[PDB]
Design an enzyme around this catalytic site. Structure first.
Site, PDB file in Angstrom:
ATOM      1  N   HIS A 202      52.827   9.565  -6.059  1.00  0.00           N
ATOM      2  CA  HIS A 202      53.630  10.525  -5.314  1.00  0.00           C
ATOM      3  C   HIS A 202      54.209   9.913  -4.052  1.00  0.00           C
ATOM      4  CE1 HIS A 202      49.619  11.001  -3.413  1.00  0.00           C
ATOM      5  NE2 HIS A 202      50.342  11.143  -2.320  1.00  0.00           N
TER       6      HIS A 202
ATOM      7  N   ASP B 179      48.169  10.367 -11.147  1.00  0.00           N
ATOM      8  CA  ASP B 179      48.887  10.001  -9.932  1.00  0.00           C
ATOM      9  C   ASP B 179      48.382   8.655  -9.429  1.00  0.00           C
ATOM     10  OD1 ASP B 179      50.258   9.852  -7.570  1.00  0.00           O
ATOM     11  OD2 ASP B 179      49.096  11.411  -6.568  1.00  0.00           O
TER      12      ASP B 179
ATOM     13  N   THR C 225      -4.116   0.614   4.639  1.00  0.00           N
ATOM     14  CA  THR C 225      -3.449  -0.635   4.980  1.00  0.00           C
ATOM     15  C   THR C 225      -4.175  -1.418   6.065  1.00  0.00           C
ATOM     16  OG1 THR C 225      -1.314   0.256   4.327  1.00  0.00           O
ATOM     17  CG2 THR C 225      -1.323  -1.616   5.818  1.00  0.00           C
TER      18      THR C 225
ATOM     19  N   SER D  74       5.486   2.477  -0.351  1.00  0.00           N
ATOM     20  CA  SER D  74       6.762   2.337  -1.036  1.00  0.00           C
ATOM     21  C   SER D  74       7.155   0.898  -1.348  1.00  0.00           C
ATOM     22  CB  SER D  74       7.861   2.981  -0.195  1.00  0.00           C
ATOM     23  OG  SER D  74       8.327   2.090   0.800  1.00  0.00           O
TER      24      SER D  74
ATOM     25  N   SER E 155      46.627   8.910   2.133  1.00  0.00           N
ATOM     26  CA  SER E 155      46.915   9.109   0.724  1.00  0.00           C
ATOM     27  C   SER E 155      47.186   7.776   0.049  1.00  0.00           C
ATOM     28  CB  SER E 155      48.115  10.036   0.559  1.00  0.00           C
ATOM     29  OG  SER E 155      48.291  10.402  -0.794  1.00  0.00           O
TER      30      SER E 155
ATOM     31  N   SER F 273       0.810  -1.208   0.000  1.00  0.00           N
ATOM     32  CA  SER F 273       0.000   0.000   0.000  1.00  0.00           C
ATOM     33  C   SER F 273       0.846   1.261   0.000  1.00  0.00           C
ATOM     34  CB  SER F 273      -0.934   0.001   1.203  1.00  0.00           C
ATOM     35  OG  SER F 273      -0.196  -0.055   2.405  1.00  0.00           O
TER      36      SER F 273
END
Length: 703
Positions: A469, A519, A296, A229, A642, A227
């Site tokens: 790097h 890089d 519902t 989503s 990194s 009823s």
DNA sequence: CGCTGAGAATAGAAGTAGGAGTATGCTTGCG
């Protein structure tokens, strides 16, 4: 009815989504945060929206999440003691004179307002049953553990109790009901947790198995509240969910009778357990993929299930006391109108002869599981329907239908292999590198700049992907040390291959210190890697492994992988950070829609860039940008983060889409931080020819 | 220290009940 004006509804550092045709709205904040003061608002009949009380507040905000204090801890102490605990704040437990500790004694405030591990309990044996313990945030009334003696649990104000609030010491020595927890409004379960806690307690562990009886049968009933989503797009998501559920349950060597029910206001019955093809798993799948739409009303659905259960014989049929019934109910509303559906569950338990004896309680023969979706689900009604079993969980609340899909995707992915890329099964007893097996720490020692702490990603058994790097040519092979699985042993390198178009010396006599274009680097390990529960590969873009991870047909172009992994939006990515030898997942957003130029525009401030005329000479098409304070307060990267992978988490798998390259400002261990604090990552879709050429012989099946 | 017969209140009827309510959970004004 009428709608409301959205002027002023936005929340500081968050977003919102309108449910039920705009008459309601939910607030969604970044991870580790929650919306203050309330999560949901309703559309008044006076044009305005619901007010914010805590005490009326001007405007909503996102504020950090706190983990509750133990209201008490019998037969021992815990510390550090405090009224509330921030995220990532461990606490340890010790037991009193002569007591015995069970459960996790080094718990930790997770990023979801919950404590890591499980409930610590101090017990001796001075009772018939065991010490039921006090789940953090609850309050147990009763301390006598003799037969038939009860204990009750209470939740703090503003919280909802999931589980049992009364456990009786049954004949045996195991407690009745299930361990309770207190649930705040915004608290959602992750697809990983739901998958694991459903699989376990659907099965028992020898791998797992489903325990039927001699000449035993199983009846499974799939009930769907279509009823809202759930029944959207002709139950498209709930179709995938149930297909994978039927498949996974068939994998255990059982042939159960299936029943299928949808319900908006009336129960529609597609498959009935009496049809001879109700055990033909693919007949059930074919009929499930054939359901269609169309207040519902749940009682009618549960009564349709009861009519399936009931029999019209004289009196009972054969093998009634050997069949085990499972009721999987998926809802997103469940304001129980049309009647009180608990009575139906009690009628069912009556019919199954459950709870009508002392040496034959028969609680093994009825399981009720509830999956609630969205914020509008009634945390109490779903918990009243679901079952309560010791050491088992039967109620779940997830945030989208997408997460409910990912639950069963994760369940299907469970027993594929150790070579399944980007696969993490979140366990009960897992450490840091259990949850990020692809991680690889690079250490390079050279006191000219400094101990360069670089991360990495295991993309195959011989290769590790990182950022160029991190290395130079002065750095000699007896200074680069790579570690995987979070071990103490360093690995052995054959060659480190840098992208052929990489040069940090720019663009040097043009007035730019560092040029981080292209890089990326690949470390070729001399030995092979031993994939395990701590070493596992990560998925790469435009490989058929990622196509199979994204649940796509084999005829899928790399461009479609791009438009699903990296659309023109604010894609929710993530990465992993070094924090005092802790491996925590920081969750960021890639500004690739309309905020992309605003992100690249914040490169100016980075060192040596404050006088560059064209900012597209340092920020090139091989860069994705994260960070900032819009639309959310992103966490920034550290100096040692990194080279690590920039991961997108989709369909319960982890796909690497970037390599962390550089940042505007280094602010790592921090928290007043600037809004120009962005981070740039190399897009792995832009360096694809190099990757394909260099990994051609690693069985990645590149597209 | 007594009526309150109408309204507030995260929605908000309309009864009148120290009601109730999906995170909570009431008071007007009249010597």
């Amino acid at each position: 009815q009428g709608s409301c004006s959205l002027e002023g509804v936005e929340i500081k550092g968050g977003s919102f989504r309108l449910l039920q045709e705009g008459q309601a709205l939910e607030y969604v904040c970044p991870s580790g945060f929650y919306p203050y003061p309330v999560q949901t608002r309703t559309c008044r009949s006076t044009g305005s929206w619901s007010t914010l009380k805590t005490k009326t507040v001007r405007k909503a905000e996102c504020r950090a999440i706190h983990c509750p204090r133990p209201h008490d801890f019998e037969n021992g102490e815990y510390w550090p003691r405090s009224p509330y605990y921030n995220v990532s704040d461990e606490i340890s437990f010790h037991c009193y004179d002569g007591y015995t500790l069970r459960g996790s004694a080094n718990r930790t405030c997770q990023v979801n307002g919950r404590w890591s591990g499980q409930t610590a309990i101090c017990d001796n044996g001075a009772g018939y049953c065991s010490n039921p313990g006090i789940p953090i945030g609850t309050r147990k009334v009763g301390s006598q553990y003799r037969l038939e003696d009860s204990v009750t649990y209470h939740c703090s104000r503003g919280l909802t109790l999931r589980g049992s609030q009364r456990r009786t010491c049954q004949e045996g020595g195991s407690w009745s009901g299930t361990e309770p927890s207190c649930q705040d409004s915004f608290m959602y379960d992750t697809p990983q947790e739901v998958a694991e806690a459903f699989l376990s307690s659907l099965t028992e562990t020898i791998k797992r198995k489903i325990v039927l009886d001699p000449s035993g049968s199983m009846n499974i009933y799939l009930v769907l509240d279509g009823s809202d989503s759930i029944g959207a797009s002709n139950f498209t998501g709930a179709k995938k969910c149930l297909v994978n559920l039927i498949e996974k349950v068939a994998s255990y060597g059982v042939k159960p009778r299936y029943g299928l029910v949808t319900y908006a206001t009336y129960p529609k019955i597609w498959v009935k357990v009496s049809e001879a093809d109700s055990s033909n798993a693919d007949w059930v799948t074919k009929q499930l993929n054939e359901i269609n739409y169309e207040g519902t009303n749940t009682k009618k659905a549960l009564q349709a299930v009861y009519s399936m259960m009931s029999w019209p014989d004289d009196v009972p049929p054969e093998g009634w006391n050997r069949t085990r019934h499972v009721i999987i109910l998926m809802t997103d509303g469940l304001h129980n109108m049309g009647g009180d559906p608990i009575t139906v569950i009690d009628e069912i338990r009556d019919l199954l002869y459950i709870g009508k004896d002392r040496k034959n309680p028969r609680e093994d023969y009825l399981d009720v599981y509830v999956f609630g979706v969205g914020p509008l689900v009634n945390q109490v009604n779903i918990n009243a329907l679901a079952s309560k079993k010791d050491n088992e969980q039967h109620v779940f609340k997830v945030k989208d239908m997408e997460n409910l899909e990912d639950v069963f995707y994760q369940m299907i992915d469970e027993s594929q292999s150790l070579s399944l890329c980007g696969m993490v099964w979140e366990h009960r007893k897992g450490t840091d590198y259990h949850k990020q097996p692809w991680q690889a720490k690079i250490s390079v020692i050279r006191p000219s700049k400094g101990h360069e702490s670089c991360m990495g990603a295991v993309v195959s058994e011989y290769f590790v992907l990182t950022a160029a790097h991190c290395f130079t040519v002065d750095d000699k092979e007896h200074s680069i040390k790579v570690s995987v699985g979070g071990e103490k042993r360093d690995l052995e390198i054959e060659v480190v291959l840098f992208h052929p178009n990489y040069n940090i010396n720019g663009k040097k006599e043009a007035g730019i210190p560092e040029f981080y274009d292209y890089d990326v680097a690949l470390i070729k390990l001399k030995n092979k890697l031993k994939y395990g529960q701590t070493i596992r590969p990560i998925c790469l873009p435009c490989t058929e492994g990622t196509t199979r991870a994204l649940r796509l047909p084999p005829t899928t172009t790399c461009q479609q992988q791009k438009e699903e992994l990296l659309p023109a939006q604010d894609i929710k990515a993530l990465f992993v950070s070094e924090e005092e030898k802790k491996l925590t997942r920081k969750e960021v957003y890639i500004k690739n829609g309309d905020k992309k130029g605003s992100c690249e525009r914040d490169a100016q401030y980075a060192p040596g860039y404050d006088k560059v005329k064209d900012i597209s000479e340092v920020v090139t098409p091989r860069f994705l940008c994260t960070g900032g304070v819009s639309p959310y307060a992103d966490p920034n990267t550290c100096r040692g983060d990194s080279g690590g992978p920039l991961i997108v988490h989709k369909r319960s798998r982890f796909i690497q889409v970037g390599v962390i390259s550089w940042g505007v400002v280094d602010v790592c261990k921090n928290k007043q931080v600037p809004a120009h604090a962005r981070d740039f990552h190399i897009n792995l879709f832009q360096v694809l020819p190099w990757l394909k050429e260099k990994l051609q012989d690693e069985d990645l099946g590149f597209l």
